[PDB]
Amino acid sequence: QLTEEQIAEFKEAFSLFDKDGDGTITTKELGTVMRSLGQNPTEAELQDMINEVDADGNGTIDFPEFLTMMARKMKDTDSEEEIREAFRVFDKDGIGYISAAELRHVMTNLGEKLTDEEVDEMIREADIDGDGQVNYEEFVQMMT
Amino acid sequence: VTVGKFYATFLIQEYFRKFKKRKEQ
Ligand SMILES: [Ca+2]
Ligand SMILES: [Ca+2]
Ligand SMILES: [Ca+2]
Incomplete structure (x- = not known):
């Protein structure tokens, strides 16, 4: 349906x-x-x-x-599998994390109408431990 | 690769939607 x-x-x-x-x-x-x-x-x-x-x-x-x-x-697809595949799409080099700068670039280009301020708040929320990277664990919480 | 790239775009757009809805509240 x-x-x-x-x-x-x-x-x-x-x-x-x-x-x-x-x-x-x-x-x-x-x-x-x-x-x-x-x-x-x-x-x-x-x-x-x-x-x-x-x-x-x-x-x-x-x-x-x-x-x-x-x-x-x-x-x-299931909710768990689709988030992992999406992470691997954005973790293009398969390093285990997306840098804050790489995620900002993806979000500005795919969001189209998002302001720098909105992307700022998104990155701050996503990067849970604040180390400048979004790993798989943080991506799942961001996406759930 | 092709389907996954389109579906990844949808999934990040869904994240944008939920983020905006919570900011508006
Ligand atoms: Ca982090
Ligand atoms: Ca056609
Ligand atoms: Ca066209």
């Missing part, structure tokens, strides 16, 4: 990538977000990533395609 609220949440995730609001995610829009986070996929790789979600093969992801993928992922 997919609630109205859940669909709206998935639309917010879709719209993060669909920055021109034209109802499709292109390779260019995917590349813009990935480059902003420090990755540099080739155009071929971006095309292959789009193709993992682009069910009708027209070269872009629309919201029915996005929703199919996101709803299936949610049904297939």
Whole structure:
């Protein structure tokens, strides 16, 4: 079952990538977000990533395609597993922690409309022991 | 990798939502 609220949440995730609001995610829009986070996929790789979600093969992801993928992922994952996978996405180097500076960068770029003050309070709350890193334990409490 | 990156974005956005809702209270 997919609630109205859940669909709206998935639309917010879709719209993060669909920055021109034209109802499709292109390779260019995917590349813009990935480059902003420090990755540099080739155009071929971006095309292959789009193709993992682009069910009708027209070269872009629309919201029915996005929703199919996101709803299936949610049904297939548990609250504990999805937080660990997300941590590993953001712990790109797999070091066991995300530095405060790295987390600030992720939050400003993915939050889009967050002020530096809001990101400040988020980082301060997340970094429980104040050592300038968010480890897995602190990430789980932040995300729970 | 692809699905996980999209789902990770959703999960951090959910964290943003809950943070804002508590700040507004
Ligand atoms: Ca678009
Ligand atoms: Ca399509
Ligand atoms: Ca810490």
